[PDB]
Write a protein that binds this ligand. Structure first.
Ligand code: NI
Ligand code: NI
Lengths: 186, 188
């Protein structure tokens, strides 16, 4: 099982390149969902680990599709697995953006944007970008209704839909409470 | 009402100075609510709540006021010397406190817990480049080290009651993180 070795190298590489905590969470989740959805677990974990490397959001860090490709083949990963990972990540991040493995990776990514973890990230992002808690259309509170509260209805697989239900319900109890703590938050 | 007009004056001033205001507005509403239940002087409570942050070291240097600047503006705005002195004694102590000072302190701490405290913790982490969890500067660490202890330091019966709901909700939020992120407590 050389795939253990290869998976471990990608983790170190990615951790090096770079948040890592998001990537790690998404990979753990992708592996879990992929197992229940009969996807290729190597592909799903690997795609999860590198799903952010080619994004335009990242500054000096952003890698090219071929840089990522070359690194995987350099680690000894096969052409077909490297090709399939690239098809996943390149299908996932272009401006204004499936197979079993692609759907699982996307689901994992989206699950990480809801629930208690999703709420944390929403407020973290707002803090980083100088945005308000509420009071603006760019605020974190607004983004729950613009985006986060709809994600459950866009999940690809039965397994991700299952996991979503609990995370979605909790975000709702969170919003209800926030609205109670701050009357006129809207 | 002369005090209604003075509070509205102070409100517009503070909002103009800080131009954070949302925190101050929430703290003033909470403080007046507690103050009324506790039979504290409501004008002093509201005024202190409104100016409680203006001298705080955490404000940037382009905005932060000296104590004399706060004092002078209050007096110009028509607050009497004695009331103005009371307000100054509260905010310099915050940055035993008086009865009104304890009410303001409680309101300020209430805003740091519950659903609103959760949001604020994560916003701060994002502002300072700190992680969600995984080290001692992380938001998660900050819950254990500081925010989960605030309920023990509430001054008033009214605040203590309000803090129980908020604290318990924050405990539910932690439980949810622990569930969704296996190993979160040990993660680095
Ligand atoms: Ni992602
Ligand atoms: Ni404050």
């Amino acid at each position: 099982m050389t795939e253990l070795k290869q998976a471990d190298q990608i983790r170190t590489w990615v951790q090096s390149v770079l948040d890592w905590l998001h990537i790690s969470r998404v990979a753990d989740l992708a592996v879990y969902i992929g197992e229940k959805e009969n996807a290729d677990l190597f592909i799903v974990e690997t795609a999860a680990l590198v799903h952010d490397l080619i994004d335009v959001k990242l500054p000096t860090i952003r890698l090219s599709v071929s840089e990522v490709y070359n690194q995987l083949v350099t680690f000894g990963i096969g052409k077909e697995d490297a090709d399939r990972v690239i098809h996943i990540i390149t299908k996932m991040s272009f401006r204004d953006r499936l197979s079993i493995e692609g759907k699982v990776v996307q689901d994992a990514d989206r699950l990480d944007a809801i629930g208690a973890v999703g709420i944390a990230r929403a407020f973290m992002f707002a803090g980083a970008k100088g945005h308000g808690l509420y009071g603006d259309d760019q605020s974190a509170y607004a983004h729950f209704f613009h985006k986060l509260l709809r994600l459950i209805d866009m999940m690809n697989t039965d397994t991700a839909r299952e996991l979503a239900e609990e995370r979605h319900e909790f975000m709702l109890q969170y919003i209800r409470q926030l609205e109670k703590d701050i009357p006129g938050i809207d």
